[PDB]
């Protein structure tokens, strides 16, 4: 006969049930291959068609085997990925790189997988942790040495983390989260370029800048901040700017007074480096 698969959307548990439907002694079987997290020890399992496992959000190759001879067909299950709006505290530094992510139950084995975006393909990195419990803050952690290029290059990385209490059982993996991160010294690299100040009215100016390099990496750029300094009163003002906007209007300026403007780009966890200061007057 002919069989077609169905899949649920990823649930809060990081699972989704692969179901089956028939639309055309004989034996029918299923071979299941988990593609994501390649550094895991066990990657395939042969199952009965009737038991419908709860997969993770990883990518899978599923193929139907029939025994009597038989026939074999395969469908590549796409990796549906949840988006965590809160960015993870990923710190790239002089001595190495460190991650923190929300942990769940105790004695959990985690697989961290990342690959640089838009060299679409390439350096696919995979990491498997020893079983570990949540810290008092409810977080798990792992670290790499400086030599380990773990997000050490100033590029956008796509990260996916999986969890299992029994990593040797293929059908027990769950998705934790997926996220984007810009590696290296993102605070310095994220500095906006081509900052310009233009006369908008007799008492207002338009400030424009090129989009930060962080804006190309989804969810990384939290906001822009524009700092304006009155060089006579020494008064300073900061204006947060939506990450989708690269322009802001400053009003209430006084004639003859010199002003200074700087722009920075902030992530959820890092203050950006200020741009070169702009000197101007009405």
């Amino acid at each position, epitope marked *: 006969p002919q069989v077609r698969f169905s899949v649920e959307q990823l649930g809060q548990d990081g699972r989704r049930r692969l179901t089956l439907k028939e639309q055309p002694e004989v034996t029918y079987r299923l071979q299941l291959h988990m593609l994501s997290c390649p550094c895991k020890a*066990k990657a395939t399992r042969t199952l*009965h068609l009737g*038991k419908m496992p709860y997969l993770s959000g990883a990518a899978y190759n599923v193929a139907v085997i029939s025994s009597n001879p038989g026939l074999n067909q395969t469908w590549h299950i796409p990796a549906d990925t949840h988006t965590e709006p809160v960015a993870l505290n990923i710190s790239v530094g002089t001595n190495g790189t460190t991650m923190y992510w929300p942990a769940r139950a105790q004695s959990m084995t985690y697989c961290i997988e990342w690959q640089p975006v838009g060299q679409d393909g390439g350096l696919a990195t995979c990491s498997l942790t020893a079983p570990q419990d949540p810290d008092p803050a409810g977080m798990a952690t792992y670290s790499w040495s400086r030599e380990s290029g773990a997000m050490g290059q100033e590029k956008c990385y796509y990260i996916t983390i999986f969890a299992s209490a029994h990593p*040797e059982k293929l059908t027990l993996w769950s998705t934790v989260l997926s996220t984007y991160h810009f590696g290296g010294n993102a605070s310095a690299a994220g500095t906006p370029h081509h900052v310009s100040v233009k006369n908008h009215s007799l008492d207002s100016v338009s400030v424009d800048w090129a989009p930060s390099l962080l804006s190309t990496c989804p969810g990384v750029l939290k906001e822009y901040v524009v700092r304006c300094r009155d060089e006579d009163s020494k008064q300073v003002s900061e204006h947060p700017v939506q990450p989708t906007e690269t322009q802001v209007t400053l009003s209430g300026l006084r004639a003859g007074v010199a002003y200074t403007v700087q722009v920075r780009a902030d992530t959820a966890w890092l203050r950006g480096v200020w741009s070169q200061p702009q000197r101007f007057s009405i």
Partner: antibody
Amino acid sequence: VQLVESGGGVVQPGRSLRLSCAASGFTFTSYGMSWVRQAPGKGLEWVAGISYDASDTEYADSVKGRFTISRDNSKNTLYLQMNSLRAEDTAVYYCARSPDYIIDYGFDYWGRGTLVTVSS
Amino acid sequence: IQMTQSPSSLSASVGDRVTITCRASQGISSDLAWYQQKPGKAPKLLIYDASSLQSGVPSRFSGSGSGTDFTLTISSLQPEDFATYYCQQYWWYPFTFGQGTKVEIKR
């Protein structure tokens, strides 16, 4: 992790008896459960199983129409309703845990077991 | 699915290398488990997925095989290993056990 069976004893043939298993030490709602019985001088026989959300239930052929497995996830209790009991059902009944959502793989935790004697 | 173990019983001494076989009436790939039971006690899971060792089990235990023929192996028999051993398929419902193999002490 502990599993405690209760409700066993003597029961006349054709009558009914309800077994209960109390679970503790883990998240009861996240694991499938099963019952396994063992006649005194005999080997092991899998009786019934149920998934984590009680959506999947399976029974052995020798008990299909006669037994009923169920779970109360709010009270961490597994149940086995036995009706129309025969003498062959006389066995020690264990409750055991499955490591996944679905009824799958081996049984990593077992209870003490309770004796059920079916006789008049 | 019928699960046939061989032999039904065997006698061995401490230190011996023990091998039990398990045979399935139908092909079950790797969905097989092994259990150990002592008189008057609940069974204990030793090996799953035909060859994965369960946590806490000593390294002297090992399993292998696929399809219809499976083997359980104890490299060096220890005094606490004398018991009865059962294989079980979970390839499909209803789950079925083998008849058991009793490992006794030879004298």
